Design a protein around this ligand. Structure first.
Ligand SMILES: Nc1nc2c(ncn2[C@@H]2O[C@H](COP(=O)(O)OP(=O)(O)CP(=O)(O)O)[C@@H](O)[C@H]2O)c(=O)[nH]1
Ligand SMILES: [Mg+2]
Ligand SMILES: [Mg+2]
Ligand SMILES: [Mg+2]
Ligand SMILES: [Mg+2]
Ligand SMILES: [Mg+2]
Ligand SMILES: [Mg+2]
Ligand SMILES: [Mg+2]
Ligand SMILES: [Mg+2]
Ligand SMILES: [Mg+2]
Ligand SMILES: [Mg+2]
Ligand SMILES: [Mg+2]
Ligand SMILES: [Mg+2]
Ligand SMILES: [Mg+2]
Ligand SMILES: [Mg+2]
Ligand SMILES: [Mg+2]
Ligand SMILES: [Mg+2]
Ligand SMILES: [Mg+2]
Ligand SMILES: [Mg+2]
Ligand SMILES: [Mg+2]
Ligand SMILES: [Mg+2]
Ligand SMILES: [Mg+2]
Ligand SMILES: [Mg+2]
Ligand SMILES: [Mg+2]
Ligand SMILES: [Mg+2]
Ligand SMILES: [Mg+2]
Ligand SMILES: [Mg+2]
Ligand SMILES: [Mg+2]
Ligand SMILES: [Mg+2]
Ligand SMILES: [Mg+2]
Ligand SMILES: [Mg+2]
Ligand SMILES: [Mg+2]
Ligand SMILES: [Mg+2]
Ligand SMILES: [Mg+2]
Ligand SMILES: [Mg+2]
Ligand SMILES: [Mg+2]
Ligand SMILES: [Mg+2]
Ligand SMILES: [Mg+2]
Ligand SMILES: [Mg+2]
Ligand SMILES: [Mg+2]
Ligand SMILES: [Mg+2]
Ligand SMILES: [Mg+2]
Ligand SMILES: [Mg+2]
Ligand SMILES: [Mg+2]
Ligand SMILES: [Mg+2]
Ligand SMILES: [Mg+2]
Ligand SMILES: [Mg+2]
Ligand SMILES: [Mg+2]
Ligand SMILES: [Mg+2]
Ligand SMILES: [Mg+2]
Ligand SMILES: [Mg+2]
Ligand SMILES: [Mg+2]
Ligand SMILES: [Mg+2]
Ligand SMILES: [Mg+2]
Lengths: 205, 369, 81
RNA sequence: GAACUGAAGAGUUUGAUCAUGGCUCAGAUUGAACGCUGGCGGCAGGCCUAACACAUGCAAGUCGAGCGGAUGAAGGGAGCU
RNA sequence: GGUCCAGACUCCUACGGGAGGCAGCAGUGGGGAAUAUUGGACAAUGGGCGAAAGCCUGAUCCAGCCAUGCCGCGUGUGUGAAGAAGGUCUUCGGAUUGUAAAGCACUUUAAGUUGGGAGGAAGGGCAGUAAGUUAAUACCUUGCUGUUUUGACGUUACCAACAGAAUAAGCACCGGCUAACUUCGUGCCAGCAGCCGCGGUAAUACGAAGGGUGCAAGCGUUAAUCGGAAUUACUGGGCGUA
């Protein structure tokens, strides 16, 4: 399945940016993002350790739009690997095909990139892949189907990716709308406020 | 893409079932309940804050306010199956179905036995018929389907359904005994079913005879002989001696002016359950009389609330077959339960739809029980 | 007798075969004394179509093992390559 | 060059406290069943109870190049036509 | 799925006389909370016989049914403040549902229709050719060549075109343990409950409504095993008064 519905409620509940709109105008002037959603928005209501762990895990899940069972799978495979499962989890989550397409800049949001992937418009190594979970390997050359390169959405999102901060680990050729995924980003490159140790503590229980 | 302020009124979609309340109707209309209450009071019948109203007024108020509406079918599955059930062409005459009715011991089983040369009357516990039987016979004039029914007053319901699928009734009355209560019951059943009646005075070989008081008795019951006004034909028979049976059969088949085109045999078959039972070795077995279409072996059939596909299909005397004509009685195997008499069977030719419709019916059947 | 035949693994519509030496009166997927290779009908990519251990095959042939028709064809196919 | 690397507590006896001690909860699993609800596909699984009684179909045959024998086409045709 | 003897239980009978063994595959009745089709083919892999064609094969390969499990994908995407109408609450100012809706613009995955389209196939028949076989260009065995012939699944996997947002969200919980709160009814009643326990006139615990929190084609309850339990303590407990 997939979460469909209001997307500014999640930002208000988590209390942070949690990029879910196109980012065109702003985030503050659409949802007054300083109250928790619902009737009792003004109450502060500090929360326990379990609440903090749950909020962190839910925040990560709500940013990539992954449900609970697939998150369990990702966590299990990350723990099975070597080298600090906490950062292996983000290493794994950054290699998803929809996330890669979003980073390359062919989609306004994660959901838009997911629909680009699902609707048979993205080819990974020169053949169509429509699974928004395909782990992109380093060196793969993602592209767009020639019959769909003149869609207004990709061109519109190209400049938005132009001004959002350089990722500096993928490359893109704009004329042919074709890019290369050099390598999965290091833990430093990602936002150093997602404290994954809370996730590890929550699941190891 | 900019934001434009709407100018005209707002219109919604209104979903109305069999019944609806004013509060919830207004809720779907995005309007207050007090305003619609006063609107109803101003035009026609006043309404309460929580008064249940029908489909017609709900659709009226939906259409006057301008919002689009659509009615909700409480039995959408049933009507969807019915509309998608069948449609064919062509028409071919079918063998007539005739039921036999009368008073006790007036000699109807003997009449059928002489017609078929079968003598089932020798069997039968106690000397009385207690089961409704259907036989397909090749008479010297043609093909007929006879239905023998018990004459006792305790099987009245069994007689009623017997008149539901006959279109012709042979009323046997004994010459010596005359009009008896079950004769009145049989004529009432025939009149209710809207069915032609052929009367046969039996036991004419007795020295008492007197086959003329029956004429007056049936005339007083609104059944007129061939003479006089003329509604039904009379004929004297002797059942055991077999005199007059030929003329009775010819008179019965003379009522072939009812055309009786059974539609194409190529249509999916329909029928009615006549006799359902349970067998320790083959499960629930249903004796059904085809009405039109054709029933084939290995066909998905929905009967009553039991569904299932026919593993096997026997005729009256065993000998498994693979076909069933427009008016042939057959015993089918393969249902998941024992149906009750009077239910209808239809070939669905689509297993899924049959399954959810049958489970649907079973569920409300448990709820109603 | 002792025969060399194919034991079917894999999955639905995707067969995989093991070259197996068995007593003849066993289930197709039951007891065996030795497996001496495999055969892949689909193969494709980096997979190999079939592989055979020459020494074991020759030893079992010299002991009187009777290959099946398909195995008889595959053995000389492998030898040719 | 790898074949492993891993261990949480809480509620409840008292006016309150520490200890002892039982009960209960948070996890992972089913050949599961039941209630409500139900779009698709891939791969698996499906009488755990009565080793209870079984209607009807099929599940073990092959060899005429071991042997008598009877059914013996196509034809060579002949004769009367 | 053979013989004989005896036994229990069914059945046929012309009344003298015989037959039977689904814990093989489908199937029935019964018992139960509960577990499926009287399906297709020997095309593939095996097995029996044959010399060879070939015959048999409920093994097997495949289909049917069932959210029973595991995995994957859909039920749209962007913009959109008069912060619409309605519902809910209120200190009557307003807040919330909420960019959520409507409007505007995009796309067609899956399902729907139509056209293309592999792989599972090794072999068999016929004719010629070359070697070996003897005593022999014969028959026969083997190589190769040429021709012909094989698929239940199957309307295969897959690929392409067409119209449109149209065809597709529910379940549990919200006093603490434990993430999530207020109103309205009821008054030791009706009820809830895993443990503490709530309910006797302002109930965040009962029943509804608004809001929220978890999961999601599933969600809960019941049954059962291990863990937590160092609570049978080898690792790793104790015995003055528990
Ligand atoms: N004299 C005479 N007797 C007859 C005639 N037909 C039948 N019977 C006798 O009447 C008796 C009853 O007849 P039957 O046919 O059994 O009557 P029924 O209508 O079947 C009785 P039920 O209503 O239970 O079915 C029988 O013994 C039969 O011998 C007839 O034509 N003449
Ligand atoms: Mg899932
Ligand atoms: Mg009778
Ligand atoms: Mg009597
Ligand atoms: Mg009398
Ligand atoms: Mg069934
Ligand atoms: Mg075995
Ligand atoms: Mg075994
Ligand atoms: Mg304790
Ligand atoms: Mg206390
Ligand atoms: Mg239950
Ligand atoms: Mg249910
Ligand atoms: Mg239900
Ligand atoms: Mg058993
Ligand atoms: Mg049993
Ligand atoms: Mg056979
Ligand atoms: Mg021989
Ligand atoms: Mg047996
Ligand atoms: Mg014996
Ligand atoms: Mg004996
Ligand atoms: Mg015996
Ligand atoms: Mg048995
Ligand atoms: Mg069985
Ligand atoms: Mg058993
Ligand atoms: Mg049963
Ligand atoms: Mg039962
Ligand atoms: Mg079940
Ligand atoms: Mg079974
Ligand atoms: Mg075979
Ligand atoms: Mg032969
Ligand atoms: Mg078969
Ligand atoms: Mg499934
Ligand atoms: Mg269920
Ligand atoms: Mg199951
Ligand atoms: Mg308002
Ligand atoms: Mg498609
Ligand atoms: Mg092929
Ligand atoms: Mg096609
Ligand atoms: Mg809390
Ligand atoms: Mg409750
Ligand atoms: Mg109150
Ligand atoms: Mg509670
Ligand atoms: Mg409550
Ligand atoms: Mg429940
Ligand atoms: Mg339980
Ligand atoms: Mg237990
Ligand atoms: Mg338990
Ligand atoms: Mg222990
Ligand atoms: Mg325990
Ligand atoms: Mg411990
Ligand atoms: Mg010790
Ligand atoms: Mg101790
Ligand atoms: Mg001591
Ligand atoms: Mg003491």
């Amino acid at each position: 399945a997939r979460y469909i519905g209001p997307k500014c409620k999640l930002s208000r509940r988590e209390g942070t940016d949690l990029f879910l709109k196109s980012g065109a105008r702003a985030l503050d002037s659409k949802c007054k993002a300083e109250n928790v959603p619902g009737q009792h928005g003004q109450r502060r209501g500090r929360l326990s350790d379990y609440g903090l762990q749950l909020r962190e895990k839910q925040k990560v899940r709500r940013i990539y739009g992954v449900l609970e069972r697939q998150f369990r799978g990702y966590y299990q495979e990350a723990s099975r690997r070597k080298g600090s499962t906490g950062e292996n989890l983000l290493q794994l989550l950054e290699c998803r095909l929809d996330n890669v397409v979003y980073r390359m800049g062919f989609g306004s949001t994660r959901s838009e990139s997911r629909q680009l992937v699902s609707h048979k418009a993205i080819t990974v190594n020169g053949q169509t892949v429509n699974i928004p979970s395909y782990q992109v390997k380093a060196g793969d050359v993602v592209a767009v189907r020639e019959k769909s390169k003149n869609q207004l959405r990709i061109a519109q999102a190209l400049e938005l990716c132009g001004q959002r901060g350089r990722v500096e680990w993928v490359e893109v050729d704009l004329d042919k709308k074709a890019g290369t995924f050099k390598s999965a980003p290091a833990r430093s490159d990602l936002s150093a406020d997602i404290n994954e140790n809370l996730i590890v503590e929550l699941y190891s229980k | 893409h900019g934001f434009q302020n709407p100018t005209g009124p707002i219109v919604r979609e209104v979903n109305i079932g069999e019944t609806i309340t004013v509060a919830e109707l207004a809720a779907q209309m995005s309007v207050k309940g007090a305003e619609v209450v006063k609107f109803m009071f101003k035009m026609g019948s006043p309404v309460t804050i929580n008064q249940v109203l029908d489909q017609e007024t709900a659709q009226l108020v939906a259409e006057e306010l301008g919002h689009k509406v659509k009615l909700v079918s409480e039995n959408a599955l049933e009507e969807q199956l019915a509309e998608s059930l069948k449609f064919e062409g062509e028409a071919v005459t079918r063998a007539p179905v005739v039921t036999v009715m009368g008073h006790v011991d007036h000699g109807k089983t003997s009449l059928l036995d002489y017609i078929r040369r079968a003598k089932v009357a020798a069997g039968e516990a106690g000397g009385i018929t207690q089961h409704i039987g259907a036989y397909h016979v090749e008479t010297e004039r043609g093909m007929v389907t006879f239905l023998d029914t018990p004459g006792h007053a305790a099987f009245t319901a069994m007689r009623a359904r017997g008149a539901q699928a006959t279109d012709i009734v042979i009323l046997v009355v004994a010459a010596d005994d005359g009009v008896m209560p079950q004769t009145q019951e049989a004529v009432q059943h025939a009149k209710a079913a809207g069915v032609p009646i052929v009367v046969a005075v039996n036991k004419i070989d007795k020295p008492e005879a007197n086959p003329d008081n029956i004429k007056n008795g049936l005339a007083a019951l609104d059944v007129i002989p061939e003479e006089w006004g003329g509604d039904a034909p009379f004929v004297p028979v002797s059942a055991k001696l077999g005199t007059g049976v030929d003329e009775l059969l010819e008179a019965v088949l003379l009522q072939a002016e009812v055309l009786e085109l059974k539609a194409t045999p190529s249509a999916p078959g329909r029928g009615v359950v006549v006799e359902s039972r349970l067998d320790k070795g083959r499960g629930p077995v249903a004796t059904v009389l085809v009405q039109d279409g054709t029933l084939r072996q290995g066909d998905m059939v929905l009967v009553g609330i039991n569904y299932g596909r026919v593993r096997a299909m026997l005729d009256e005397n065993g000998k498994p077959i693979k076909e069933a004509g427009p008016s042939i009685p057959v015993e089918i195997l393969g249902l998941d339960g024992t149906p009750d008499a009077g239910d209808e069977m239809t070939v669905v030719a689509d297993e899924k739809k049959a399954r959810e419709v049958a489970l649907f019916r079973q569920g409300k059947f448990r709820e109603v029980k | 007798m002792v025969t060399i035949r194919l034991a079917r693994g894999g999955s639905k519509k995707r067969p995989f075969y093991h070259l197996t030496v068995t007593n003849s009166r066993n289930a197709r997927d039951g007891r065996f004394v030795e497996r001496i290779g495999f055969f892949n009908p689909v193969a494709t990519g980096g997979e190999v179509r079939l592989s055979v251990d020459q020494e074991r095959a020759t030893y079992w042939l010299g002991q009187g093992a009777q290959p099946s028709e398909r195995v008889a064809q595959l053995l000389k196919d492998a030898a040719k390559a």
